[model samples]
Target: AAKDVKFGNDARVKMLRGVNVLADAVKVTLGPKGRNVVLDKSFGAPTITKDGVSVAREIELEDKFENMGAQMVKEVASKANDAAGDGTTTATVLAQAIITEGLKAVAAGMNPMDLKRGIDKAVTAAVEELKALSVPCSDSKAIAQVGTISANSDETVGKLIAEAMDKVGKEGVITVEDGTGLQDELDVVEGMQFDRGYLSPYFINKPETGAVELESPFILLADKKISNIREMLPVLEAVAKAGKPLLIIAEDVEGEALATLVVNTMRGIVKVAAVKAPGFGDRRKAMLQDIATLTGGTVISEEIGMELEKATLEDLGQAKRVVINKDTTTIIDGVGEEAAIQGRVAQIRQQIEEATSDYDREKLQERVAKLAGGVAVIKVGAATEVEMKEKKARVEDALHATRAAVEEGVVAGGGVALIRVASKLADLRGQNEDQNVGIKVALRAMEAPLRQIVLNCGEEPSVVANTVKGGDGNYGYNAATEEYGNMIDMGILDPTKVTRSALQYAASVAGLMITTECMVTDLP
Candidate 1:
């Protein structure tokens, strides 16, 4: 016999049940001592990871209704990961707690919209409180702590990332690449990077090996948009006849020009790659000018008082080597002398300082930063494939955390920040009676992260939460040591940007999840 399908309150209960199940799975993966989840594949090898989003994504259920509920929770965690890099587990736990608690209030005959309003109010208050608690971080040791915490307390990776930051300065770019070695290393090199890569796949002679490398490429940089192939034929002819690879960095390559380049590369008539220039507006001009200075060539642009139609082989640039990736390109070993490059850099700086408008100044500042920018390549190595994968993930987390700290600031970690914000929300709930019911639920939800951290450490969450709440604002428990102390003094901290993003994203998703009163789906 066919079974009776669930509807209304029963359906809502089933949905919430599925969500709760999914949340519980990831909740254990929170905090510094969080356990990893091993995921098995039906057709391939199984894998293990501690990342919350990865775990959330791999969850599957035979029941369609239950899968829908789990997907909602996954969406929350995924957004948290995208916005902040870390904090996925915290976001998922909070969201689940919010939905579970809010549903209880609804069952007791409370209004869902009122609860959502209260949640919104609480989120705004928490964000402001988080910002207020943030302390400016410039010290390398303090910044390294942020990275270490994000990387699951791997201090070696943290220190390496910190050293990389110190070497490259704040405005520089850091890239991570796999290497064959016993240990990780950092290399600081001179190069200019663009976000655009080779315009066509045919330009890559060896597609399987990744980024194409060219030796002594002839470089043509332009600020003007190019749509016709004729304008570039003269330069392309020169490069082809000379048997040298050609690299064109331009504002745009379209129609016949793009097709011609791809066809010629495929036919072996010319070894060439085309990439669009980086930045927009005046910033684009600045990048082109920088490339020009580095390569000892003229930036052919009608906007910049140069005629591209009249450009010849004499106006083209030369570089010792060029590396082209899918979305980035780097020019190395340029022909320009140090003094000439310095002179051009000085001229750009003067123009930036003299610029009156905020937009102009901001664009020019980015231009200056790019010219002065340095690159740090982090090479990751390990003895086994699994260990290598895990180590690379840790290094990436550390890199992102360090960048967040440098850009914004730092805050107390170990759930201290969230706990303090919860206290603040509790105080705010008292001042307003209109949405007190929902605010109360939000206050309770906010405490879930600290409670989860305590539980993950094998401690009593209730007792530790009480201890944290009753003590001075700076106090927190270190699950790794099973001890209580000042989080800042203990060197437990997180980036202000990451923490605030987590809270904001968690609250937004939680509010929406709790307000959902129905689960509707079509049969497969």
Candidate 2:
């Protein structure tokens, strides 16, 4: 009989080998001077990127069992990327180092669970220290600097994002769209922004266009959520009869209603795009009202005492053009009077001023901004496809970085923040000798990012780290300039929330991996 199991040192080593390989690949891509990884696709063109998540996401091991370990590390890096938009490299490096160090304790007969307990304690302490080091970054210059750092040190991209943020205000939405033109520019337009897209892929006429443009698409703005297909059938049938593309903005659309729309779109009977309305509760209501004001149509919802079942052509709004993509939609040239739009805007502002709660007031204020009608459309352009791909990535990073800075203030960057926390953690470990092993290992692991940054700059990591460690708390090493000094004064900053999220996620995932001793694979 053939055995179907692998356990103990063999399984653990194999798993570590895979995880280490992925970590090593991504670790070098840290810092401003980090190297880029070229990932070749099986069916499409290869991608060259310095983004840690993008690099980790493309890794696939030949060994099935080892692939499992790689996938686990990739997920943590991806989570870090999604949460912070930066620090993925640091997360991957920290996770791998922590796990590697943890395995040593496991081999020395220390309980894995105990090690995890220590790691959790150390992580909590480190996060608290990081929070203490954080400084406010609400100003446009600081916000732009945050963008610049995140966008691979691209200042032009940083400026563009900063300007967009200023125009849209803090709570406003800024969208990035690729362009084929020679120059990049911001086009401010009037529209409502939301996190919804077309219901059917068949409605997309050209993928390269980035947006599906429809001529005079009938707008069906619903306040009520639609779960059943029948409720939409009445409107669908009417759109098909009129041979006009339909755009439905509702609370929700699911089940057969979504499927029918897909089939109809595929069959060319009618073209339709259904998306959820923007915001929540009263904010959602305000969004619907804004759309109605812009298009000169009535918003049908239960709150308004209107039913979707009793909808008609007269209930529909008319737009001269509707441009939609996978994540956003913009209705252009809507039939409405400027005076009416202005009146609605004033009413929203008045309501905002009268609102008692800060939350309600904020929502109402956002509605007023929406009614004020301006959208900064970033047209990202480049000379070549490869250049364009990289530029787009930078712009996206810049946008997210700006948003992150606005949402949460920043802390010292260039690995200085983590280094400071590591020193603090070292002191705490000395105070609690009983928890020294895990704390010691975590302290060492926290230094990996700074070391990696020095290595990326073609310097001896240990020497640079030692030099910086000997200095005051404000001291940091600039990898790009190969200099050591005060990072904060040098304008090297990172969003405090991003750093906190990365550390928390990395510690949790690394602890989970470290505690797992067995890797079982079911064999045929």
Candidate 3:
């Protein structure tokens, strides 16, 4: 295939242009008082959002080279979000700042190697310094404050987030859903959840909701695949004789077993849903046991001398309500006794204490927490569809940011943390003059996000940046109120994880873009 190619300065210039364009569009929505971007979605009312990554996703260039650069920043933005749940906009803003300065240095005959190394080193130090400035978020008030700032200064959403966090605790998962009315609501599920989805869509009782909801259902827990209908004849007949629905959780339900269940569900012969069991290998067995204990049923496993045909209604577990979606299943109000559940919780807690790796211990902690703590669901609402979408995005970001805050801690918002810590990088010299200049470049770029926030507010960037640079320990300008004070005390702060991830990802991609010497594209 024929393609166009560029090398040396030409390649970097086009890429830099694309980065600038996308970052230009994204950085405007940097702070609490930042402006909104209207995105046309081709049909219904356009999406109007103040979210940074939303704006980044909407941009594409006719020139593929520039698009590649925009695409790179977008990649980092997405990954940063995935890593920390927030700071995508801040990352995009920082990416441009680093890439812009780094590329200019390369264009001026500076060595790219030294420049990249300097930026890398500076980013590392900045992350460590940012960590030092972080204040642990140990209460609901602080959690609410972080949420409010991240949700674009929406106090209601912030309070709701804090309430969700408080109800579920830090380890529990909080999910945000769009609501039908203008009232914001929180629903905390009583039972545990697992990463398992319905085996077939045909089993959906609520087609509009795209999920199956079973009430007072009998849960069939199997430790192996159920492939033959003949094997489950007795259990099927047993469930049919009973008036309640049936939920089958197994390792895998393939071929006829899956098809037969779907057919029976459609024909009204039986109300049933099948889902693949959660976890893998030995852990799969362990999780099955967990579910069986929660639902008060015995897992039908070959290793346990049990067969499908031998199972009866008495062998199954029961639940007050079971909801199955495509992504996950929630077992609400499991019929297990409180004493039994508490016993399982204690057993898992012991396992958590014995685990050597933090990763394994963390997983065990999640299991214990889910077994004990409940799940919180936040329903976000607004008067209009646009407002609903906008509010949901803000709420989602704020939720993740609040969680990240609890995980690591938080620093003053309005990009105060970056500016406050960047000053420490002043004496951080490198191997060469080019490297020293690289640190200098990063030093100036540190003020970019804060400056952009002030710039959006019609204030002079230099003055605000200089004023912020002079402050210490959460002391910075609050653009929302146009005042100078301690940002943490003012309830204006960011999760340290968000800022650290943003800087790290920004420096990673931006440094790579700066060092690029060649590019290739298909003929257009």
Best candidate according to TM-score:
2
Candidate 2 overall lDDT versus native: 0.78
lDDT of 2 by residue, 1-524 (tens): 34356667676677788888998778878888888888888889987887676678678888866788888878887777667767777888888888888887777877777788888999999998887777877788887777887776788888888888888776666767667776887766566666566666666875644457777888899888877877778888888888888888888777787777777777887888777888777777778878987887888887767687788877778776677776668776577787898898888888877889998888777667666645666778899878887798678667877787778778778777887788766666533443578888888888878898888888998999888777767678888788878887777777887788878888988788877767666563
| Runs off by more than 4 Å, candidate 1 | 1-18, 60-69, 107-109, 144-163, 176-188, 191-344, 378-394, 430-434, 514-522
Candidate topping lDDT: 3
For all candidates in order, the CA lDDT equals 0.77, 0.78, 0.84
Whichever of 2 and 3 has more TM-score, that candidate is 2
| C-alpha TM-scores of all predictions | 0.72, 0.76, 0.74
Cα-based lDDT at residue 149, candidate 3: 78
| Candidates 1 and 3, the one with greater lDDT | 3
Across residues 350-465, which tens digit of lDDT does each residue of candidate 3 receive? 99888999988887887777777766777799999999988887887788688899899988878999998897667898989998988888877877899999988888989989
lDDT of candidate 3 vs native? Answer: 0.84
